[PDB]
Every structure is written in structure tokens, then in C-alpha cells.
């Protein structure tokens, strides 16, 4: 996260760290959506251009964390993966269209003050809140600048951007399964996701029911926090039919 701040304790209790077993290292962010299901970006798990093709046994998830590097004894929980599910139409070849994946945990995780699931949006909450100028929040342990790494989880609040501005900022083909967020060059505030924040949640707090909803997944950007560029996020509601199908079937 670039130009963010340190998270408060328990501020993002759905935040998940995807952790490589060997070598032991951070791989991505992710989010807790129930006691046994974790949501992330598909490119955290499968990205052939970079020879990335992780299997269940390569990975752990670490839930309840705040410090990036510490083992947070009596606070964090570490879970093994039963199964990975990648969207069947995830487009790793071109533009990261449908950049979404689910991971089922081997055993349910116990909720706590530090571990709690986020909501997924219904159609109406999505329609009400996914509007240009409305702000969401991104959290992660990724890099603090494009060209370095945080002691603790970082947080940044960013406005959703008008779709023509998103389109006109990039040469990538953008789709309805994406939205972009960030400040414009003239606005006097900045911030972005960056490398290592991939797969983490873009959340919004509904003013109707005072609950947090995950609207986006950290997906792609050109550099980090560049003027005139924006971060792009997987549109969780647009892909919710697939999420529901996987959870119901598996």
C-alpha cells in the first residue's frame, strides 16, 4: 500500500495473508468470507507469464494478523488449504478479466476479536455504493512504493473513478468485471495498492446497515501510485454467481 497508514488493531479482521511454505514468504493478500472460505485474486495462484502455478500444498493462510513478519502467537491462526478454485474464465493471457479465486480451508477457523468474516454484496448494495467518487478501503502488506516494506498492515481509503477516466488512463482492455479507484492528479491526496497487496479486499461500509462489504479484489495497476494511473479491482458482485456456485457445490 502506497501513501496509506498503519491499520488499527482489529480494523480489518477479515484480512488474510497468503503465505508460501518454502521459502517462507508473503505471496498475496486475501479475505475471510466464512469460517472455511477465503477469497483472493486468481493471479495470486495462477499466472503463467511468471511461471506461477501454486497448488494447495504449497501454501498456507494466516488469519488475524497485524505485523507483516512476526509470528503473532495467541492471535493469528494458520490454516492449511483443502482445495483451490479459480474462475473458469479467468483471463491471465490478456487483461486479468475475472481475477478471482476461492480457497477452502482444511478445518474451520475460530472467530475472535481479530478474525471475523466480511460480507459479500447483494445487487442493491453494489448498485448503491459502486459509484464514482464513493470511497472504499484497501488493506495489505505489500510494498510502500513502486521502487520499502511495512512493519504492520497498511490501510488506504480511495475513491472509485468514473469508467471513462479508468479506460482513458490505460492501454489494457478493461471489462465490466473490473472497476478502478484512486485520486486524480489535481486532487491533492494520493494512494494505491502495490506489489504484494494482490488478492486483498477493497471494502465499503454500508450506510444502510453499518456492515462492511467486499466490493473489490486488488487486481492490477501500472506501477504504483503513478499520477494519471489508477488501481484496478475485481468486481466481486459481478462474479458472485460463480462464488455462490462453488460454495454451494463444494
Amino acid at each position: 500500500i502506497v501513501e496509506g497508514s498503519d491499520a488499527e488493531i482489529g480494523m480489518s479482521p477479515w484480512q488474510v495473508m497468503l503465505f508460501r511454505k518454502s521459502p517462507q514468504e508473503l505471496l498475496c493478500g486475501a479475505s475471510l468470507i466464512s469460517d472455511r472460505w477465503v477469497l483472493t485474486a486468481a493471479h495470486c495462484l495462477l499466472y503463467p507469464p511468471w511461471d506461477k502455478n501454486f497448488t494447495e500444498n504449497d501454501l498456507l493462510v494466516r488469519i488475524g494478523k497485524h505485523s507483516r513478519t512476526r509470528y503473532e502467537r495467541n492471535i493469528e491462526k494458520i490454516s492449511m488449504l483443502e482445495k483451490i478454485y479459480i474462475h473458469p474464465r479467468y483471463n491471465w493471457r490478456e487483461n486479468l478479466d475475472r481475477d478471482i479465486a476461492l480457497m477452502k480451508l482444511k478445518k474451520p477457523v475460530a472467530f475472535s476479536d481479530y478474525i471475523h468474516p466480511v460480507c459479500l454484496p447483494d445487487r442493491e448494495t453494489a448498485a448503491s455504493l459502486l459509484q464514482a467518487g464513493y470511497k472504499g478501503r484497501v488493506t495489505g502488506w505489500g510494498n510502500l512504493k513502486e521502487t520499502g516494506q511495512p512493519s504492520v498492515l497498511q490501510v488506504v481509503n480511495l475513491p472509485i473513478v468514473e469508467r471513462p477516466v479508468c479506460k482513458d488512463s490505460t492501454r489494457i482492455r478493461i471489462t465490466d468485471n473490473m472497476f478502478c479507484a484512486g485520486y486524480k492528479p489535481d486532487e491533492g491526496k494520493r494512494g494505491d495498492s502495490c506489489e504484494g497487496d494482490s488478492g486483498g479486499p477493497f471494502v465499503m461500509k454500508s450506510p444502510f446497515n453499518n456492515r462492511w462489504y467486499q466490493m473489490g479484489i486488488v487486481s492490477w495497476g501500472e506501477g504504483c501510485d503513478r499520477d494519471g494511473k489508477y488501481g484496478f479491482y475485481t468486481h466481486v458482485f459481478r462474479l458472485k454467481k460463480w462464488i455462490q456456485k462453488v460454495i454451494d457445490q463444494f
Binding site: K21, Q24, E25, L26, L60, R62, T69, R70, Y71, I78
Partner: peptide, 11 residues
């Protein structure tokens, strides 16, 4: 750079 996690999780 990361503190070693407990061996039980690497079984």
C-alpha cells in the same frame, strides 16, 4: 525476513 512459523503448520 519472516519469523519462522511453528513446525506443526509445515507438516
Amino acid at each position: 525476513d519472516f519469523e519462522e512459523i511453528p513446525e506443526e503448520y509445515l507438516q
